[PDB]
Design a protein around this ligand. Structure first.
Ligand SMILES: *[C@@H]1O[C@H](CO)[C@@H](O)[C@H](O)[C@H]1NC(C)=O
Length: 31
């Protein structure tokens, strides 16, 4: 159920300016 992790991450990265390419390092949900 990777889509659960993906949806979390997409919602988390909702404040990235237009042309963004960045590595986010945090205490993110794991599998
Ligand atoms: C979280 O993701 C859902 C879609 O699964 C979306 O409808 C909702 O608005 C998102 N929340 C935030 C804060 O982006």
């Amino acid at each position: 159920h990777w889509n659960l992790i993906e949806n979390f991450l997409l919602n988390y990265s909702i404040r990235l300016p237009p042309n963004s390419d960045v590595v986010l390092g945090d205490y993110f949900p794991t599998v």
